[PDB]
Symmetry: C4
Subunit: 332 residues, 4 copies
């Protein structure tokens, strides 16, 4: 019998590693952190100066965040928990502030196609087909329909996935980037409510095995707690990281300042929380107030630059080839 039970070796398919399970190994380097090139592909056509995008959540990204992210060299993805006209108006607002990149989330419901076209009319650069489980005919069809209809002018992101097969299906459907993360978010309760999830280092490694041979970039979405996790996500093969919790405490995020026990916080809630939907798969929580976005991004990029120095990675493409050491429980 299999050592963990039963007679089927495939029943437990893999050992899933998360960010805390690994560290980047130093390697021969003549790269100064200040001189590293942090640019990376968000999609097949769109390259960002900083490999970071903000989550499509209503306590993270509206027009103010999207503008600040683009100015910092990344991009915002506008959330879709609002009327079509209002989302498209936020797209226009971002475009009014110069030649700034912006993305926007759409679902696969019956209002989704109309939402997508209105966003297109407003001048959006990236449409994100925004689901918790992309390995589904309705999601794949939406990605494909969008790519064939507006694909010349707009890049189409599909997600989320956590397996190689799912990433492969999105590639076949025509996705310009594949977003990875089922279960890892800081406000996520999918693991305890549904018992479903996939540790994010292993999910990225698997998704990249399907996407990289087709020249399709992977966006690592969820579970990033520290700037060092961004370096780990990219070294596992992702091309960008999408951040929720790490940006939710910034001045530019939606929501007001909250004072509890003499300390400052902002509300941060899952799009699957009871509040956002009003069976919940997210919580409503708090994150410490962090000040201006520009400063948070500077600290995050700073940690990434340090990782590039330690690993001898002159570019993000080189960082994607770095090696890990796996650590034990004691290592934490």
């Amino acid at each position: 019998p299999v050592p963990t039970g039963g007679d089927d070796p495939t029943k437990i398919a893999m050992l899933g590693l998360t960010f805390d399970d690994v560290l980047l190994l130093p390697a021969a380097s003549d790269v100064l952190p200040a001189n590293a090139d942090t640019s990376s592909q968000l999609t097949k056509k769109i390259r960002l100066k900083v490999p970071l995008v903000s989550s499509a959540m209503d306590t993270v990204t509206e027009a103010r965040m999207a503008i600040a992210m683009a100015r910092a060299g990344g991009m915002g993805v506008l959330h879709r928990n609002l009327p079509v006209a209002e989302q498209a108006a936020q797209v226009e607002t971002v475009k009014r502030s110069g030649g700034l990149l912006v993305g926007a989330a759409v679902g696969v419901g019956d209002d989704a196609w109309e939402r997508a076209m209105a966003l297109r009319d407003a001048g959006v650069d990236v449409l994100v087909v925004d689901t918790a489980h992309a390995h589904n005919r309705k999601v794949l069809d939406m990605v494909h329909r969008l790519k064939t209809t507006v694909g010349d002018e707009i890049e189409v992101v599909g997600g989320n996935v956590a397996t190689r097969a799912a990433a492969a299906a999105l590639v076949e459907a025509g996705a310009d980037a594949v977003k990875v993360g089922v279960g890892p978010g800081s406000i996520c309760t999918t693991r305890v409510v549904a018992g479903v999830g996939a540790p994010q280092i292993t999910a990225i490694l698997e998704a990249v095995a399907a996407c990289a041979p087709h020249g399709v970039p992977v966006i690592a979405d969820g579970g990033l707690q520290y700037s060092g996790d961004i370096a780990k996500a990219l070294a596992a093969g992702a091309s960008t990281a999408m951040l929720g919790s790490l940006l939710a405490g910034t001045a530019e995020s939606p929501g007001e300042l909250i004072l509890v026990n003499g300390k400052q916080f902002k509300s941060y809630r899952g799009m699957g929380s009871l509040g956002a939907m009003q069976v919940p798969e997210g919580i409503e929580g708090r994150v410490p107030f962090r000040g201006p976005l520009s400063t948070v991004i500077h600290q995050l990029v700073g940690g990434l630059r340090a990782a590039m120095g330690y690993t001898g990675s002159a570019t993000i493409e080189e960082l994607q080839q770095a090696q890990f050491v796996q650590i034990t429980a004691a290592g934490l």
Copy 2:
């Protein structure tokens, strides 16, 4: 020598996984959670609408709980810590409330046979031969005697087991379902008192390897803390889950409301606790008050439906074929 000591590779027979050690992997899906079929075999003949049964404990299941469980599409198993006439009267009470399924626990003591016949006379549908260790001639004989005597009209459950050999012995004795769980209960101290136990994912996988080829359903009993654990238990191959702690805080469970530190609780105690027996293998504890049973069951089934959506499982039989990823300590 064996890496963990000695010269005998069989001394440490297996690596035992519990619920927290695994997550369900998403798979290709065209299943909507609302449309998933949650029905499953409790026994060879009896199929439930919801794959959940309440524990035969005196702080979990008497007539009120049994009626509410059956109305919710599951079933109650009436505890046996009371006189024969009173248990049989609870069976009659459940039957007075319509065509509701009900089960009842019996032991293997010398009063057990008389208890079983009185329950039969009262119209019980399921007899549960209710022990902490079923791999024992007296237990196997009781299962067999019951099956040969009342088996045409009543389904006979045997338990508990934690090994493949034990499950196989119950199958041979004629059990209509095999109940799995030695040591995993939330109020259990068997692990620290006797040093005995078996992590429940591995126990289910092993029991199912003996039971499934004979068409005998497995009931996963104990250690379930979250709705996601129900999905994991079924994916490991169980057909139903038996719940104690998760239902002990409901309005329909026996016992009164307790207020401590401004919060509401109900008493929840092991049938092996000093109180229930009045060498203890259970504690007397508290669980948070949860409100009506119907609402708890709705939340639990909701999480199960989400898991079925993520895994592409249209039925419980399909969910039994889902795959796991094993996670590390950091993953918790």
Copy 3:
């Protein structure tokens, strides 16, 4: 290279398991706990009714404890942190209370031989050559000299060891029992002071591999926190367990009652603590007051009997053949 570093596979010699790493697996059983035979060899010639002996520590075993242990069916080992005449007087005191077995500790210093002879004159049954590291010529010589001089009338225990080679050396020197435990004691700081130790399940398995083929019993000494650990120690192949912390809180142990924060305690200190020696390898601590020894022993034996029921072990010799499942961090 070796996965954990370097080029030498023997540098990290084994994976060491402690009690918390394993559980006993249930097995086919027709053993009632009340009818199990708990007798076991303390030494080649001496069989105890209960397989438990009290530690040779000055907060655990003086005459009162030794008498109570023998009456309970086990044995006490009198500590040696006192003058020779006083230790021998405690031996006489135990013998005055009927035909009770008693042991006594000796070191390997230059006063050790005289201590041993005085204990012999006083009628001791067991001499324990009592060291932290028995794999040493001076210790082996002391064991051998004792066995050749007083071996017809007195059984000679040697310890402590944690490796197969060390246990083998004691067997060759003529030990009648081998005591296992380097580093596992509850009050031990050897692991953090010296960085030395050996997880106790693996140490027992290794020692037993050297001792059992020569008919020499193993005493598991240290690290036992629960009655279930006694069952685990014996199933790993030990014949008896030596208890310090679990007995230090009893009425019969030396020392007075201590009240802190409204709760009752007794002092419990390592023989390697600064206080006992007045570079420390033990701490001075507290254990909860537990009441009479007889009651503690009854609870401990109760847990052992339960384990024998679950595993189908009619005797301690059968329990030594039981199997384990290894558990994960989540299992704790």
Copy 4:
């Protein structure tokens, strides 16, 4: 696919062990702790009486610490966070106190060469090329230039490294000792800021595999919390240990006494902390006040002597050949 994800077995290059992951196994011994020889090579030419050196940090080592360390039989490495003239004056101060060994840190900036020559003029014995990542042409060139210019009179240490390849490069450049530790320091945030690091037992094992065949000693730098960790570091193959946190609380370290909550502390800060640089990779913290250095060193050496007794190591060279057992999470 690889069990942890992707198709590349080299992506996760190793399983990294830290000090808490292992224990030293006892072995046959006729070594008394008091008689063990604790001397060891700091560099190819310089042997210390005690195998300990103090960190080049401005809350650990200035002239007072360096003098006390040398008197205790070890050595201090003077920090370089001060003007060249002042560092060289501290070297002179140490030399004024007798024939005491002293080292001093230099960087690889454009002021580094002038700093090195001024230290040479002041009579320093050891120059430590002091970086966070030595596998870099500028660092290797500095080591080589120093060795070829002042190598007859001064020993040249290079560091830090965490891989076999990096240690090999320093050996080739002419280093007289290689210092190991990237990420393990108690005040380090490199692991969370950059996601970079290497568990220290594995790092030492790897570095030693490159250095020992060339007769180059390894200094284990960082992560040592207990005296037992010193024994583990040396048994992994290091020849000396460099201590920061363990010495930062001593009377001889720079800084004043701090009283918080009725207890005494001293400030201890990373050289990568915001305070020391005024993207931080260290924190500013506190350590308990420990009293005189001589006493701390005596306790540390005491633990080392105990380890040498347990392992039968008469010399540090013998201790370098000792074996480990790997422990589990439960073992902690």
